[PDB]
Short mmCIF file of C-alpha atoms in Angstrom, two decimals:
data_model
loop_
_atom_site.label_atom_id
_atom_site.label_comp_id
_atom_site.label_asym_id
_atom_site.label_seq_id
_atom_site.Cartn_x
_atom_site.Cartn_y
_atom_site.Cartn_z
CA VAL A 1 109.63 -19.03 -176.11
CA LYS A 2 106.07 -18.06 -175.21
CA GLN A 3 104.60 -18.18 -171.72
CA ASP A 4 100.81 -18.29 -171.93
CA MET A 5 98.59 -20.38 -169.63
CA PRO A 6 97.86 -23.65 -171.46
CA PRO A 7 96.62 -26.94 -170.04
CA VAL A 8 99.47 -29.41 -169.64
CA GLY A 9 98.67 -32.22 -172.08
CA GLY A 10 95.04 -32.54 -170.98
CA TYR A 11 93.53 -32.67 -167.49
CA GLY A 12 91.42 -35.22 -165.65
CA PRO A 13 87.65 -35.39 -165.93
CA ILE A 14 85.23 -34.18 -163.27
CA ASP A 15 82.02 -36.06 -162.51
CA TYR A 16 78.50 -34.93 -163.34
CA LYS A 17 76.41 -37.61 -161.63
CA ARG A 18 73.77 -36.96 -158.98
CA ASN A 19 75.71 -39.21 -156.61
CA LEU A 20 73.20 -40.47 -154.05
CA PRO A 21 73.75 -43.48 -151.74
CA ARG A 22 70.09 -43.80 -150.56
CA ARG A 23 71.34 -45.96 -147.67
CA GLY A 24 69.58 -46.81 -144.42
CA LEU A 25 67.11 -49.55 -143.65
CA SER A 26 64.05 -50.60 -145.63
CA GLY A 27 60.43 -50.24 -144.57
CA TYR A 28 59.95 -53.74 -143.16
CA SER A 29 63.21 -53.94 -141.19
CA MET A 30 63.00 -50.49 -139.57
CA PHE A 31 59.29 -51.06 -138.90
CA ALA A 32 59.92 -54.44 -137.26
CA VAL A 33 62.83 -53.31 -135.10
CA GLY A 34 60.81 -50.32 -133.86
CA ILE A 35 57.82 -52.49 -132.97
CA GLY A 36 60.15 -55.06 -131.39
CA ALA A 37 61.76 -52.54 -129.05
CA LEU A 38 58.24 -51.25 -128.36
CA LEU A 39 57.07 -54.71 -127.29
CA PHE A 40 60.23 -55.17 -125.19
CA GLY A 41 59.39 -51.96 -123.35
CA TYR A 42 55.81 -53.17 -122.89
CA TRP A 43 56.88 -56.45 -121.30
CA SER A 44 59.29 -54.78 -118.88
CA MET A 45 56.62 -52.16 -118.12
CA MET A 46 54.05 -54.84 -117.28
CA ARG A 47 56.50 -56.60 -114.95
CA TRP A 48 57.47 -53.45 -113.03
CA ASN A 49 53.87 -52.28 -112.69
CA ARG A 50 52.59 -55.53 -111.20
CA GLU A 51 55.47 -55.79 -108.70
CA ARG A 52 54.84 -52.14 -107.84
CA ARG A 53 51.18 -52.94 -107.18
CA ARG A 54 52.34 -55.68 -104.78
CA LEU A 55 54.33 -53.13 -102.79
CA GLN A 56 51.52 -50.58 -102.85
CA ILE A 57 49.14 -53.21 -101.43
CA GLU A 58 51.69 -53.67 -98.63
CA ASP A 59 51.45 -49.91 -98.00
CA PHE A 60 47.66 -50.23 -97.82
CA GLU A 61 48.03 -53.00 -95.26
CA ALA A 62 50.30 -50.73 -93.22
CA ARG A 63 47.62 -48.04 -93.04
CA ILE A 64 44.98 -50.65 -92.19
CA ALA A 65 46.94 -52.07 -89.27
CA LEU A 66 47.90 -48.60 -88.06
CA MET A 67 44.45 -47.04 -87.87
CA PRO A 68 42.40 -47.82 -84.69
CA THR B 1 70.34 -32.87 -176.90
CA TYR B 2 68.12 -32.64 -173.84
CA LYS B 3 67.46 -34.34 -170.51
CA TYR B 4 63.95 -33.76 -169.23
CA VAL B 5 63.18 -34.62 -165.62
CA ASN B 6 60.47 -35.95 -163.27
CA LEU B 7 60.26 -39.26 -165.13
CA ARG B 8 59.42 -41.70 -162.38
CA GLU B 9 56.09 -42.98 -161.45
CA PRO B 10 55.30 -44.04 -157.87
CA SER B 11 55.84 -47.77 -158.26
CA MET B 12 52.81 -49.89 -157.40
CA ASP B 13 55.05 -52.76 -156.31
CA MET B 14 54.48 -53.39 -152.63
CA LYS B 15 58.14 -52.89 -151.68
CA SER B 16 58.45 -49.34 -153.04
CA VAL B 17 55.06 -48.19 -151.78
CA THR B 18 55.67 -49.58 -148.29
CA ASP B 19 59.09 -47.93 -148.28
CA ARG B 20 57.49 -44.58 -149.12
CA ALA B 21 54.80 -45.21 -146.49
CA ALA B 22 57.43 -45.99 -143.85
CA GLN B 23 59.29 -42.89 -145.03
CA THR B 24 56.13 -40.86 -144.43
CA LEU B 25 55.17 -42.40 -141.08
CA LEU B 26 58.68 -42.76 -139.66
CA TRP B 27 60.26 -39.36 -140.55
CA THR B 28 63.36 -40.77 -142.21
CA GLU B 29 64.84 -38.27 -144.65
CA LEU B 30 64.30 -35.45 -142.17
CA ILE B 31 66.78 -37.31 -139.97
CA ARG B 32 68.97 -37.68 -143.07
CA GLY B 33 68.90 -33.89 -143.39
CA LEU B 34 69.91 -33.58 -139.74
CA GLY B 35 72.77 -35.97 -140.47
CA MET B 36 74.01 -33.78 -143.32
CA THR B 37 73.84 -30.69 -141.13
CA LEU B 38 75.78 -32.42 -138.36
CA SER B 39 78.34 -33.43 -141.00
CA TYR B 40 78.87 -29.75 -141.62
CA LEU B 41 78.79 -29.07 -137.86
CA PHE B 42 81.87 -31.10 -137.08
CA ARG B 43 84.01 -29.51 -139.82
CA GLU B 44 86.38 -26.60 -139.29
CA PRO B 45 85.19 -23.10 -140.16
CA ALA B 46 86.60 -20.95 -142.94
CA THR B 47 86.56 -17.72 -140.90
CA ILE B 48 89.64 -15.55 -141.04
CA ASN B 49 90.07 -13.45 -137.91
CA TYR B 50 89.67 -10.20 -139.81
CA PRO B 51 91.49 -7.30 -138.06
CA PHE B 52 94.55 -9.50 -137.67
CA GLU B 53 94.28 -11.95 -140.57
CA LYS B 54 93.49 -9.81 -143.57
CA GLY B 55 91.89 -11.53 -146.53
CA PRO B 56 93.64 -12.67 -149.70
CA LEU B 57 93.79 -10.34 -152.68
CA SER B 58 95.26 -10.05 -156.16
CA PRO B 59 98.30 -8.27 -157.61
#
């Protein structure tokens, strides 16, 4: 017998495609969810700032009543 | 027998051009590159500890 290195009856194929998934969101959906979380942060920001101004006015009234 | 490249035009349909505009003004594929680099971060390294583990050779 002979003992070279042949391929055994043929081998499987190997791909040659530029395999790209291009996944992720679109323009509109990513854009809208970013602006939506932005507006959520704005609303909570507005609420905290106006309640904070209430308390800071109370601090002003403390210094007024303390002064003379 | 040839396959020449760079055959796409920038599509003037509103979907494709707003997707490229959101790609430009949202920094998307840069984050995709960071994702690929993190995918190689959490692998296991192919570093043999040299003075103990000596590298493979041939007969």
